Amino acid sequence: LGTRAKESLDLRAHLKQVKKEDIEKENREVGDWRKNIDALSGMEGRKKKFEG
């Protein structure tokens, strides 16, 4: 019984390690943008839209 429990736990732990290795590996892909605002109180362009 102890041997069976040990082998089952070993297999489960090995699978969990294989998963968790890549789980911790590339977890920085969550870096994205937040798109805050600044009120753009300094835009003083001219009316020359020809490019559309």
């Binding site: 489960r12 294989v18 998963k19």
Partner: protein, 371 residues
């Protein structure tokens, strides 16, 4: 270098580098040409908006999915989708990265061969490998046995696996999936007055289905309750106002999964094809499959499905066996997480289909030892 774990899917393309937790870029797989004439000059109007860009200009486009049921029906559009995925959503040239596509079970050979031929000739990858979408979902759960029901958006397939030895004679592939549920919901909404017809409004009906529908624990009791009280009627605001109220359409749309006779399909529901898939297995591994039933895929995210399915299987199965349904919270990306884990393994590093091998045997190499 790092491997690219792409996952074509049907409805959402999920991609990202191997070894992370979540796909880097997830976006619908639709390519929509404009349909009106266009009068402004120099506006910079393109001829086809793909990916998430065509979900914002969908008011004047005709979106059309390039993947119908697992299989790919329009190869030019699929090539366009892949090109977008590589160059704009990941910005990594494919000349320096292995790729790991995914494919549903029991699909036509020509689809897989054309996929590998494209990946090797057009994008010119170093090496690509095609894997069955259910084995990955079993990887992600950290198990090594279990019968996985991967109800995607294109096709629902049910692959049983024991001790790492897949049982090829017990795969039950059924073509009811999220898209048919969207169409059926769009068809039963007409019973209150709301008519959605345009291919753009299918997206609105999909959003309604995602946000409101749920799977009833017992169907007849819910049908009786919704017909007397009004505690179920949840309202939803269209993209222009004019809120709508969904009554007993809420649990009737996803009920089609357990009674495919609603949309005229003959076959049995996802509650009985799993039991049939188990009973085809050998008599000595049925207990383990009963105890390790795995759910995956997007469509299995309905609130309350992990209880309805367990109740149904417990009704069907012998009374002594314990029925357990594994429903991880990261169900939607389970296949891609498993793909990342598989691509990150050292033992797997020599199974890729190297380009010189393809040059020697042609595209039919995929059916050979390098599966």
């Amino acid at each position: 270098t790092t491997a690219l774990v792409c996952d074509n899917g049907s409805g959402l393309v999920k991609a990202g580098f191997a070894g992370d937790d979540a796909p880097r870029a997830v976006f619908p797989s639709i390519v929509g040409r404009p349909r009106h004439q266009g009068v402004m000059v120099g506006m910079g109007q393109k001829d086809s908006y793909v990916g998430d860009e065509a979900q914002s200009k969908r008011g004047i486009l005709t979106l059309k999915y390039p993947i119908e049921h697992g299989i790919i029906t329009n190869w030019d559009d699929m090539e366009k989708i892949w090109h977008h995925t590589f160059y704009n959503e990941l910005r990594v040239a494919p000349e320096e990265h292995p790729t790991l596509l995914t494919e549903a079970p029991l699909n036509p050979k020509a689809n897989r061969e054309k996929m590998t031929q494209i990946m090797f000739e057009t994008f010119n990858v170093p090496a690509m490998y095609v894997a069955i979408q259910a084995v990955l979902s079993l990887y992600a759960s950290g198990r090594t046995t279990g019968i996985v029901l991967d109800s995607g958006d294109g096709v629902t397939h049910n692959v049983p696996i024991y001790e790492g030895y897949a049982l090829p004679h017990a795969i039950m592939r059924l073509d009811l999936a999220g898209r048919d549920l969207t169409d059926y919901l769009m068809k039963i909404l007409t019973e209150r007055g709301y008519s959605f017809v345009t291919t753009a409004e299918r997206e609105i009906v999909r959003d309604i289905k995602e946000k409101l529908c749920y799977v009833a624990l017992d169907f007849e009791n819910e049908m009786a309750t919704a017909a007397s009280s009004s505690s179920l009627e949840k309202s939803y605001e269209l993209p222009d106002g004019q809120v709508i109220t969904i009554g007993n359409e809420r649990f009737r749309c996803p009920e089609t999964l357990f009674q495919p006779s609603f949309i005229g399909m003959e076959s049995a529901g996802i509650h009985e094809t799993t039991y049939n898939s188990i009973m085809k297995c050998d008599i000595d591994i049925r207990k383990d499959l009963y105890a390790n039933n795995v759910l995956s895929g997007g469509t299995t995210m309905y609130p309350g499905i992990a209880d309805r399915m367990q109740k149904e299987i417990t009704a069907l199965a012998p009374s002594t066996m314990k029925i357990k349904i594994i429903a991880p919270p990261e169900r939607k990306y389970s296949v891609w997480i498993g793909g990342s884990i598989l691509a990150s393994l050292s033992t797997f590093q020599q199974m890729w289909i190297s380009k010189q091998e393809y040059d020697e045997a042609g595209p039919s190499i995929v059916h050979r030892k390098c599966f």
